Symmetry: C3
Subunit: 187 residues, 3 copies
Amino acid sequence: HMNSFYSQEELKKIGFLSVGKNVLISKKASIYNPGVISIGNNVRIDDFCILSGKVTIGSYSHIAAYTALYGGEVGIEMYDFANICSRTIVYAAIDDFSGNALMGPTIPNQYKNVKTGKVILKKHVIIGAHSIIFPNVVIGEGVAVGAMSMVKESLDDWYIYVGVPVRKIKARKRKIVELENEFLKSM
Amino acid sequence: GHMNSFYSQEELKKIGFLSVGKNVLISKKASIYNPGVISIGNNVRIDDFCILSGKVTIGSYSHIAAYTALYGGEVGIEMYDFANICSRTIVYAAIDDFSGNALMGPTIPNQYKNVKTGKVILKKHVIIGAHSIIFPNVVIGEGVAVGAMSMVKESLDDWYIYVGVPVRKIKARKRKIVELENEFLKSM
Amino acid sequence: HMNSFYSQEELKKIGFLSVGKNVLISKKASIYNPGVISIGNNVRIDDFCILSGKVTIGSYSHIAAYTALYGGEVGIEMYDFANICSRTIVYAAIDDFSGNALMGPTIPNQYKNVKTGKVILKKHVIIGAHSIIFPNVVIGEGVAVGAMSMVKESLDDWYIYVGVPVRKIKARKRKIVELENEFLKSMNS
Ligand SMILES: *SCCNC(=O)CCNC(=O)[C@H](O)C(C)(C)COP(=O)(O)OP(=O)(O)OC[C@H]1O[C@@H](n2cnc3c(N)ncnc32)[C@H](O)[C@@H]1OP(=O)(O)O
Ligand SMILES: *SCCNC(=O)CCNC(=O)[C@H](O)C(C)(C)COP(=O)(O)OP(=O)(O)OC[C@H]1O[C@@H](n2cnc3c(N)ncnc32)[C@H](O)[C@@H]1OP(=O)(O)O
Ligand SMILES: *SCCNC(=O)CCNC(=O)[C@H](O)C(C)(C)COP(=O)(O)OP(=O)(O)OC[C@H]1O[C@@H](n2cnc3c(N)ncnc32)[C@H](O)[C@@H]1OP(=O)(O)O
Ligand SMILES: Cc1cn([C@H]2C[C@H](O)[C@@H](COP(=O)(O)OP(=O)(O)O[C@H]3O[C@H](C)[C@@H](N)[C@H](O)[C@H]3O)O2)c(=O)[nH]c1=O
Ligand SMILES: Cc1cn([C@H]2C[C@H](O)[C@@H](COP(=O)(O)OP(=O)(O)O[C@H]3O[C@H](C)[C@@H](N)[C@H](O)[C@H]3O)O2)c(=O)[nH]c1=O
Ligand SMILES: Cc1cn([C@H]2C[C@H](O)[C@@H](COP(=O)(O)OP(=O)(O)O[C@H]3O[C@H](C)[C@@H](N)[C@H](O)[C@H]3O)O2)c(=O)[nH]c1=O
Ligand SMILES: [Cl-]
């Protein structure tokens, strides 16, 4: 009732492709295929998350509770200082909604029409709570997506976007760049 | 436990479903309440952190993705074959009156509430997009797709795509899947 | 496959600052720092709930499944007959989104700009499913917010609000206060 994280010792036994230091991962998260999951330094992953398939997270990243990263074979990668608020989903693959294909894991591949492509969250990206990131997009450096937003296309750097699907509403301030440098120097 | 969280077939048998078919993959991390009123057909996968509570009937060739709640209550939620539900969806067969005419929820005796109930049926080939909510007494017509983050309070016409809160019809669903279903069952 | 609630024996082992009678808490919920968590009578908290930090719940309240109450230091408080539909998040603190500050628990405080403020849900508040309430917000007595709502500012009493962010759409009926009084009167005589 203080925390649910793995000890450093249990972390080493998971079998991650790579795992940094100061990594706090909830025992109530699910991790599938850990040998294609890579995690940098100073990363917290909270209860009821799902990481499945190829996922790469850098350093100084919080993946908050309920967040699903479905990396599949193509991968999701997050750069340093990116953070995801609770209940986000990032899909690297999704079925065709149009009616031109059967759907999902109970059906053989030949009848489906999966949209897939690597998803990247660049440095300083923040994803607002209850958001969905669809496949084959890059969320630009310093981009903020508001809560309950839906993204289907790559997003231009250093803007804040809101809505379903998102629209640009204003520039993201770049003082965090200054602070990153100040912070890193301080160490 | 880093490959999958599903029950073995011998484990499923011990849950005590009204009926459960073959090639059924149900996460040990999902919750299942009143399994004696739940039935599940063949080739079904239900993922981590789902909840199925009360009367839920699922056919064959269906994925209920992670975090989905199917609150069937006493009236029931029914999905037909080839229906699927994306992550984080909720389907309610019963909900409390929000007007201010009634008290609300499970801590309150029934005489003070005014629960709206009605079966929710998803017909063949329905797909429900992620983070959606379906409310009681709604028939989601054959082949309907509902987009992500959509809210459905009324029945939806067959073979159309709907989006928004609450949903609006935006374009017809293609029906190539009907051929595909036939070609796939014919392969078997 | 009947229910996931802690027995009364298990509950007493949790360590709440205060917990009342007829408290039904899912063992599949997460409770962090129960020492600052107070719960009244006739409360139900479902599977995959998270309660973390300073949370005070009154009586006749259902916290439905997936709901997360991040009370932090400043606290989240719910008055009696308040209820929260599934998959809501209530934040008593959040990071600055603007780009003026670094973010999240991996960064020291001096580089962040956290907004914080007590969040209060008054009597008879209902929060629709899949909603978010932000910090420093008082949800007025009898307020309903609809499904998928986002609330960043305090809400005036006895109205229904919907949308992201919410707008006031209609009055909420007050018959519920007459029912509260009827209900409580029957418990007494
Ligand atoms: S990690 C903990 C989780 N934190 C969060 O999820 C925080 C998310 N914050 C937000 O979604 C904010 O609302 C942001 C995106 C930061 C915008 O806040 P601002 O204060 O910068 O802007 P306004 O509130 O003035 O709104 C600007 C226009 O955008 C609409 N809008 C704001 N937020 C959203 C969301 N999330 N979804 C849809 N629309 C949103 C406002 O209605 C406003 O629209 P106009 O058309 O200009 O009125
Ligand atoms: S099972 C794993 C999870 N998969 C999903 O949740 C997939 C959900 N897919 C979608 O929500 C798509 O956006 C769908 C519904 C398939 C629509 O995509 P289309 O490519 O057919 O259409 P457009 O992107 O051109 O959009 C048409 C109009 O509808 C608005 N819109 C699209 N999607 C939504 C949602 N989910 N919610 C509200 N509105 C939505 C677009 O803004 C566009 O609007 P106009 O007003 O016509 O410009
Ligand atoms: S605890 C179990 C979970 N229960 C719930 O989440 C129930 C939530 N209920 C709702 O969200 C209802 O839609 C409420 C808010 C009670 C409104 O229902 P009403 O029947 O009173 O109102 P209408 O359907 O006539 O809608 C009024 C206007 O509001 C728009 N709207 C309704 N609901 C929403 C939500 N959730 N989000 C955004 N907008 C919403 C309708 O489109 C309508 O708009 P107009 O511009 O007036 O047409
Ligand atoms: C959400 C969640 C929390 N926890 C545990 C570990 C966390 O350290 C603890 C608190 O997490 P939280 O997200 O509720 O709060 P945090 O946002 O970490 O903030 C906390 O630490 C800060 C440095 C202080 N400034 C805050 O006042 C204190 O609330 O609970 C888990 O173990 N798993 C979880 O999923
Ligand atoms: C989401 C989830 C996943 N898992 C386990 C079992 C799954 O078989 C495995 C991966 O599931 P997933 O949803 O991440 O991915 P799937 O949609 O099953 O897809 C995967 O298999 C396919 C046949 C291949 N075509 C894909 O490239 C590979 O990603 O993880 C669970 O045990 N429980 C879960 O809730
Ligand atoms: C959502 C959830 C349910 N459960 C268990 C406990 C509950 O008694 C049971 C059913 O809960 P539910 O939320 O599906 O349904 P309820 O809203 O409790 O409704 C039901 O029970 C009432 C006493 C009756 N008055 C109703 O007619 C019957 O449908 O499942 C859990 O143990 N944990 C959970 O998170
Ligand atoms: Cl969730």
